[PDB]
Amino acid sequence: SVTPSSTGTNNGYYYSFWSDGGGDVTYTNGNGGSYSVEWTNCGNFVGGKGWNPGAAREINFSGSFNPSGNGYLSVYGWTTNPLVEYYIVESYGDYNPGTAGTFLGTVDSDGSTYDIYKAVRTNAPSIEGTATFDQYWSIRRNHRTSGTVNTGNHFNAWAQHGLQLGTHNYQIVATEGYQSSGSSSITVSVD
Ligand code: NA
């Protein structure tokens, strides 16, 4: 059983929780900017708290992230026109999600080098429904579960590689799992 997919406002933050119904997933909004997820042999889910619309901002995040298998903790968001799904992956489990993309280079931000990848998702779920769209990745080499992400540094580095962003839609500190188990308990803020 899974928490039903849902979106909106909670304690002044935006949140989104989405799953494909697979396995067992329990998403729980907490006070302020906090949320938790526990999951067992999920399908695919993505959930967390943040803002709508996103921006070039410094996002503070802290908490726990305990993937057993493939899961990510990322600044995660969308733009439109063009439609782009982007990830600034601060921690992952046993799978580096850049495997699926093309390596374009690196960016240094907030105390670590990141590896940058572009992937193409063909007829995949999106905030505009089933669609084909680019995916931008910045994957932190020095995994962590607390600190500050300067999203503008990533937007900058992606643009240096010819990767254009559209108009910002939502932007959250997302826990994501794919065919894995685990848990997270995360708090978000911006100064
Ligand atoms: Na669009």
Residue numbers in the entry: 29 to 219
Q: Any passages from the paper?
A:
Xylan degradation requires an arsenal of CAZymes such as carbohydrate esterases (CEs) and glycoside hydrolases (GHs), with the most common xylan backbone-cleaving endo-β-1,4-xylanases being found in glycoside hydrolase family 10 (GH10), GH11, and GH30 (7, 8). Endo-β-1,4-xylanases are the main enzymes responsible for xylan depolymerization, supported by β-xylosidases. In this study, we characterized the xylanolytic strategies of three phylogenetically diverse yeasts with different CAZyme profiles: Blastobotrys mokoenaii (phylogenetically in the Trichomonascaceae clade; isolated from savanna soil), which possesses a GH11 and a GH30_7 xylanase, Scheffersomyces lignosus (CUG-Ser1 clade; isolated from the gut of wood-boring insects), which possesses a GH10 xylanase, and Wickerhamomyces canadensis (Phaffomycetaceae clade; isolated from Canadian red pine), which lacks any obvious endo-β-1,4-xylanases.
We successfully crystallized and solved the structure of BmXyn11A extending to 1.55-Å resolution, by molecular replacement using an AlphaFold2-predicted structure of BmXyn11A as the search model. The overall structure adopted the expected GH11 β-jelly roll fold, and the asymmetric unit contained five protein molecules. Comparisons with previously solved GH11 members from bacteria and fungi show high conservation, even among kingdoms, with Cα-root mean square deviation (RMSD) values of <0.6 Å to BmXyn11A, which could suggest either retention of this enzyme in B. mokoenaii after the split between yeast and filamentous fungi or possibly a recent horizontal gene transfer event. The differences in XO distributions between BmXyn11A and SlXyn10A from GX correspond to previous studies, where GH11 xylanases require three unsubstituted xylose units for attack on the xylan backbone, while GH10 xylanases can accommodate more branched xylans.
